[PDB]
């Protein structure tokens, strides 16, 4: 259902109640789905030392194949949508309307690269709460997919060509946001947890950590076929639901393979006083809310009467 409403509505994807909703919902779809052989969660309730809550539990080998989820209005509210083809979360929306439920969202937990998500209709879009704040995540949305193929054999494949063309579009949009005379450089992550340093995700129920350096090592505005990224399947990971650790059983299948569409990127720029005419961007991510937020940026829950 849809009903084009004629009036000026205000949006803000950085403070979208629905996101937290999705966040807690997904964390729950996970907990009942992907169970660890053991999870460790901190617990330093003041006291002297720190107690560590540890759970040892059944560890059935299964995979995460969630069905798309539609979010409808919660008792007492309604869902408004910004029909504008190119709208960046923060700001007023002229072409707005009421909707029954959201479009189907394929929940995907991962880092650096947003998979199987919505594509931008017009040109490429880059959203942030403050492009000026180099510490804030930049959500890049593509207008064109790019297939990423991975295997439990140890790698992920991607068109050197397609990925190339997609980067040009990104730096294009970027220099635009900062400086025309600026140069856009794409370097690898600066560091931190494994999950954040590498393009991490779960395929066939296993946790992949794939080195994305090859995807972020280029400068713009200043044989050859496929790009192979080395992955690694880990059994001990850092939880994303909360500060914690989890251990899973070793793989049981010798043929683990997944194909996804890269439909968005989570970037972060190295601000500082570089005082040059070039900005440096790196794969970011970690806060799954940005993932949810990349699909929900066009909705808002409104208290109805």
């Amino acid at each position: 259902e849809v009903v084009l409403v004629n009036v000026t509505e205000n949006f803000n994807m950085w403070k979208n109640d629905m996101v937290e909703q999705m966040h807690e919902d997904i964390i729950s779809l996970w907990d009942q789905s992907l169970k660890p052989c053991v999870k460790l969660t901190p617990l330093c309730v003041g006291a002297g030392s720190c107690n560590t809550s540890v759970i040892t539990q059944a560890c059935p080998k299964v995979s995460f194949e969630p069905i798309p989820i539609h979010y409808c209005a919660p008792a007492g509210f309604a869902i408004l949508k910004c029909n504008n083809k190119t709208f960046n979360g923060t700001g007023p929306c002229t072409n707005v309307s009421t909707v029954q439920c959201t479009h189907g969202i394929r929940p995907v937990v991962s880092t650096q690269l947003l998979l199987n998500g919505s594509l931008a209709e017009e040109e490429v879009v880059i959203r942030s709460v403050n492009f000026t704040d180099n510490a804030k995540t930049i959500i890049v949305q593509l207008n064109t997919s790019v297939e990423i193929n991975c295997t439990g054999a140890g790698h992920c494949n991607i068109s050197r060509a397609k990925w190339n063309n997609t980067l040009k579009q990104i730096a294009s949009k970027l220099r635009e946001q900062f400086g025309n005379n600026k140069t856009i450089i794409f370097k690898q992550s600066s560091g931190g947890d494994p999950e954040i340093v590498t393009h991490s995700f779960n395929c066939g129920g296993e946790f992949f950590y794939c080195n994305s350096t090859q995807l972020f090592n280029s400068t713009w505005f200043n044989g050859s076929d496929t790009i192979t990224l080395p992955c690694r399947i880990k059994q001990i990971i850092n939880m994303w639901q909360k500060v914690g650790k989890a251990m899973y059983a070793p793989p049981i299948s010798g043929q683990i393979r997944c194909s996804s569409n890269i439909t968005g990127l989570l970037l972060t720029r190295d601000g500082g006083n570089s005082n040059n005419e070039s900005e440096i961007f790196r794969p970011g991510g970690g806060d799954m809310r940005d993932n949810w937020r990349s699909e929900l940026y066009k909705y808002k829950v409104v208290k109805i009467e």
Partner: antibody
Amino acid sequence: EVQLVESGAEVKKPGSSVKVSCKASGDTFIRYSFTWVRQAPGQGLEWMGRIITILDVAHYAPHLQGRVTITADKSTSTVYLELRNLRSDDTAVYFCAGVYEGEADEGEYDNNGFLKHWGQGTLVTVSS
Amino acid sequence: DIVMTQSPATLSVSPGERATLSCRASESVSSDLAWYQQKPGQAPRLLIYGASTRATGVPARFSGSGSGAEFTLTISSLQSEDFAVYYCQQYNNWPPRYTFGQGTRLEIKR
């Protein structure tokens, strides 16, 4: 491959508690899981429990649940076994054993159950 | 409560001949089954794990097969040093509550 050097023979009265140790050397300590196994004179092997050095988590045998604790100080590459409320039937040789798990430091952990590296064993006599 | 059981309590084999050791389980264990050899006054020695993989330094005359609740330890040609006690161990369950067979004593028959 790591070498398992166990502490010396113990002599205790029933009701007492003991703490036997095992020094691991030769490889990256946190890349192995350690298990304690005991054997009473003239009898077979009895699995007591195992610890996942990396996670610092441990699991014990049921009949043993309660009065046993296995630990490890990642600084001295030492594994410790502690048995409370000793009983005369607890008299046995206590074996410390280990197996390689992969690069735990890198998140790889096969969670291997078998035991490849063993210690000389520690005799622990419980008697009045 | 997974219980392992070794068939022959004592196997009397003539030197140079073959010997087959039996170990069954009261419940399925897939292939998480290991074998150990133990000489008097010594720590056990791992021979086979994963039911059939020979462990480093273990001669080829030693071989393991089976899965589920029935396992076999076959020593092709018994050597003077092969006489000892052998134990099987199931490490299938989770939480870990691994167990041992009561052992089979391999003795020189004369």
